[PDB]
Amino acid sequence: FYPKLQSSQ
Amino acid sequence: FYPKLQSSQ
Amino acid sequence: SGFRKMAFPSGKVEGCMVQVTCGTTTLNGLWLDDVVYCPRHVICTSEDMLNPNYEDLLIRKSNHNFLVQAGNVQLRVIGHSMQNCVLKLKVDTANPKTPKYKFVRIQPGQTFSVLACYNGSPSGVYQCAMRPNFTIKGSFLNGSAGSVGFNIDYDCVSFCYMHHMELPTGVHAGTDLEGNFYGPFVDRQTAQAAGTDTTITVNVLAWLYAAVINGDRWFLNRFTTTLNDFNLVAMKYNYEPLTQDHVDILGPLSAQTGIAVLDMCASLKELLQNGMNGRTILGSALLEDEFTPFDVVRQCSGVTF
Amino acid sequence: SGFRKMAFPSGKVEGCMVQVTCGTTTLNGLWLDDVVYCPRHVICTSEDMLNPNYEDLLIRKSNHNFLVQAGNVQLRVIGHSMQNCVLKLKVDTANPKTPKYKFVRIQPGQTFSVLACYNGSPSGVYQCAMRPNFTIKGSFLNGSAGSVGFNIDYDCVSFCYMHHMELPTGVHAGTDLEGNFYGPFVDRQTAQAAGTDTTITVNVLAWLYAAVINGDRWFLNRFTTTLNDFNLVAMKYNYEPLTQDHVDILGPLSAQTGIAVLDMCASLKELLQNGMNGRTILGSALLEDEFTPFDVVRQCSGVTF
């Protein structure tokens, strides 16, 4: 997996 | 041991 | 990702905590509208907690015998009465921080957040479940009575627990906000004991679902079973029976994961008979039973208030 | 009695939580006085996730491209700047609910409470530790960036953490409130991995002291240890080395229980060798390391805020 910047769309 | 009502003094 | 023992935010409750002192006895009260609720044993002196006569103790009290402090403001008491095991102290100013609220009585297996307080001020907040034996595994010290348990829904605080006392095994007993005890306990210090406890089966299942939601999928298996066959096993390990209602409530989790409940029940069966095999689930070497299905959904879907 | 993973009361931080939207990207901000602090990747589009030049992305934005909402009120942004990995949005109104606060950078092993938010609204509060590998084992979903971690000192909130991102093992990384990341992580979605984590030894020992204070001694033994022999053993179990400062930090619990720190070290060596053999300690079948010595004293004495 890859890291996720945890804003929302 | 006995039950304790948990007020303070 | 991640799964934590998550409490509700406590600000709405924080604005309702006050201190109630009667003689040399002090505990916390809950100030809503123009009433403060607190355990009736605040009218006990140290020496009458063995067999108190609360009627007689209260009749010799008057309003000015109650010192109610809200921060650095004394509240003037203009009326007092007993409702079951709670004192209702009428005060002359309505709490301007009163949230939208209800008093609710919960059932064993349900969870809530506790704002533990001393002298009307919070020490912290944690999450509890009502055990099947009607005790609470709290963290409470002398002076903590009158702390409350609650749940939030949108903007409404449902008050469900007010703390009274500690049992000899160190677990805790209290009432709803109408002063009715949970469990066969009484507010006095004669000999009392918690009965045998059992594990909240539907909650463990909810927890395993949370694990799968978090990628802990090792306990999943190619097996299946029935509700009847599961409950034969669970009963042996001191688990509550799983009812069809419990299955229905586990529906949104089974739908979100793609695992049928009885498939999850099959994995739980294997976990009970063979154990976890030195592995852990969601950071625990025990099967956690203090998360409801809704607690899982609320946490993994990020429900806010 | 009892012992729980207890968080700080969240009310003061609840009153600082706002929503920040740039384009179609939304997350949380922290509103103190007339400044809103938020993670800088709010200025990213779905196309800017791998190798953003934030200076370049920022120069293309004006004040009115930042939509800040505090409940049902939009705040007017009158200025913006970047400080490391956070944005500071100056707004035209000071937050009337601003508490006494400080910005602090904590060390691995220290604990804090997280107020998990979405769309500027609180979802829940839980207790965390800065892991030795500079990750936190939180519970965070898409939209949770800008949630903060904190400690309270009676009436002063110390903000120590701002949430930014999730790593592939499902742990989390973030910054202090000056926008400096804990650990060697960066706010892009290229490949990143937490290093091997270790157990916070000083905290396991504090928790063992909490067990003694709550009446449990079954795990002690008749031995002592040198500090160096303790560390040679513990490190084979991926425990952090215990320093003399750690020993000093445990002095108060040592003094209250009558157990010398190196004697509790001997108990720990045996618990690691044996496991718990079907027992639990403060309700856990694992050695818990997210309680500091100060957390223990605070919960076992009734410290309030």
Numbering used by the authors:
A (entry chain C): 52 to 60
B (entry chain D): 192 to 200
C (entry chain B), D (entry chain A): 1 to 305
Which sentences from the paper describe this structure?
The SARS-CoV-2 translates its genome into polyproteins that must be cleaved to release individual proteins essential for replication of the virus. Given that Mpro processes the majority of these sites, any intervention that stops this process, such as an inhibitor, would block viral growth. The crystal structures of inactive SARS-CoV-2 Mpro, with the catalytic Cys145 mutated to Ala, with 9 substrate and 6 product complexes were determined to sub-2.5 Å resolution. As in previous apo and inhibitor-bound crystal structures, Mpro crystallized as a homodimer.
We used 12-mer peptides, P6-P6’ (with the scissile bond between P1 and P1'), in our co-crystal structures. Six of the nine complexes were solved with the dimer in the asymmetric unit (in P21 or P212121), with both active sites in the homodimer occupied with the substrate, while the other three had a monomer in the asymmetric unit (in C21). In these cocrystal structures, both active sites were fully occupied with the noncleaved substrate in essentially the same conformation. We observed that the substrate peptide was extended along the Mpro active site with the scissile bond (P1 glutamine to P1’ residue) positioned between the catalytic dyad in all cocrystal structures. The N-terminal (or non-prime) side of the substrate had an antiparallel beta-strand conformation which was conserved in all structures, with the substrate residues and side chains well resolved. The binding mode of the C-terminal residues (prime side) was more varied, especially beyond P3’ position, and lacked full electron density. In addition to the fully conserved P1 glutamine, which is stabilized through multiple molecular interactions, the large hydrophobic residue at P2 was extended deep into the S2 binding pocket in all structures. The sidechain of the conserved P1 glutamine was also extensively coordinated in another hydrogen bonding network. The volume from P4 to P2’ is highly conserved between all of the substrate complexes, despite the variation in amino acid sequences; this high conservation reflects the specificity and likely evolutionarily-constrained regions of the enzyme.
